[PDB]
Amino acid sequence: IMLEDYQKNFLELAIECQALRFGSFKLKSGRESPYFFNLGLFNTGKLLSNLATAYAIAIIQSDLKFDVIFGPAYKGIPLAAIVCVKLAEIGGSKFQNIQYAFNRKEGIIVGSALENKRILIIDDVMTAGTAINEAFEIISNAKGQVVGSIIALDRQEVVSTDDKEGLSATQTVSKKYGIPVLSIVSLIHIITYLEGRITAEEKSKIEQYLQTYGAS
């Protein structure tokens, strides 16, 4: 019910650079969505610095212990790099020696051997889990141990409206692999941010979207 400042700052910038837009949008399924998100619109030096900061503070706050930050090619490659750097810049002693790595689409791993290292997978978004599945395969081949994942925005929507469990995409992954799926923000945070920027009618109607499709 409160937003951390890093989450405020992220969301403010996402809306200003138009990475986050509000309106009527259809997903692949065909489901109405009241917003569109494209992390790729964090595309300047100022914006990428801000994004790095946001991911790094999310990570620091989670208290996850890891050795390597891994980005799935291609979009995870820059995110892994800029985040690794920011963690060493803002995280103190414990984050100086974190490594990054990523895969060539076709060894396959660019970086120090992953053997016996604890890996945090970073990416932009997750839906069906195909990039997470591929990273797990590549990482487990190199004898790494995945301890977590992080994405920018957790849509916090049920994968299906017939699933009784009502697992979201990040929940699905989290269950299957037994690891946390962190995010900078979720749908709930976007809603809290909008308090007093939108009308009561608009507030209602988004707080109703949360009801029909919100996970669990």
Q: Which residues participate in the annotated binding site for 5-phospho-alpha-D-ribose 1-diphosphate?
A: 28, 74-75, 104-105, 123-131
Helix (H, G, I), strand (E, B) or coil at 12: helix
Cβ contact 179:127 at 8 Å? no
Taking CB under 8 A as the criterion, the residue among 18, 29, 61, 112 binding a second copy is 112
Of 30, 25, 33, 21, the C-alpha closest to 214 is 33
Helix (H, G, I), strand (E, B) or coil at 99: strand
Q: Which of Mg ion, ligand PPC, a second copy, none lies near 126, with the C-beta cut-off 5 to 8 A by kind?
A: ligand PPC
Q: How far is Cα 70 from Cα 180, in angstroms, rounded to an integer?
A: 15
Cβ contact 114:144 at 8 Å? yes
Binding positions for orotate: 36-37, 127, 155
The verdict on 122 binding ligand PPC (CB under 6 A) reads no
Task: Choose between 92 and 107: whose C-beta lies nearer to ligand PPC.
Answer: 107
- What contacts 46, CB < 8 A, 6 or more positions away? none
Q: How far is Cα 133 from Cα 195, in angstroms, rounded to an integer?
A: 37
Taking CB under 8 A as the criterion, the residue among 39, 57, 87, 109 binding a second copy is 87
Between 74 and 113, how does the x/- string for binding to ligand PPC read (CB under 6 A)? xx--------------------------------------
Identify the sign of the CA torsion 159, 164, 170, 174.
negative
Restricted to residues 52-91, the positions that interact with Mg ion (CB under 5 A) are: 75
Considering only 85-93, 128-136, 139-147, 194-202, which stretch makes contact with ligand PPC by CB under 6 A?
128-136
Q: How far is Cα 147 from Cα 159, in angstroms, rounded to an integer?
A: 23
Q: How many residues bind ligand PPC (CB under 6 A)?
A: 13
Restricted to residues 55-84, the positions that interact with a second copy (CB under 8 A) are: 73-75, 77-78, 80-82, 84
Restricted to residues 122-141, the positions that interact with Mg ion (CB under 5 A) are: 131
The verdict on 154 binding ligand PPC (CB under 6 A) reads no
Q: How far is Cα 134 from Cα 128, in angstroms, rounded to an integer?
A: 12
- In the complex, the residues that contact ligand PPC under the rule CB under 6 A are 72-75, 123-131
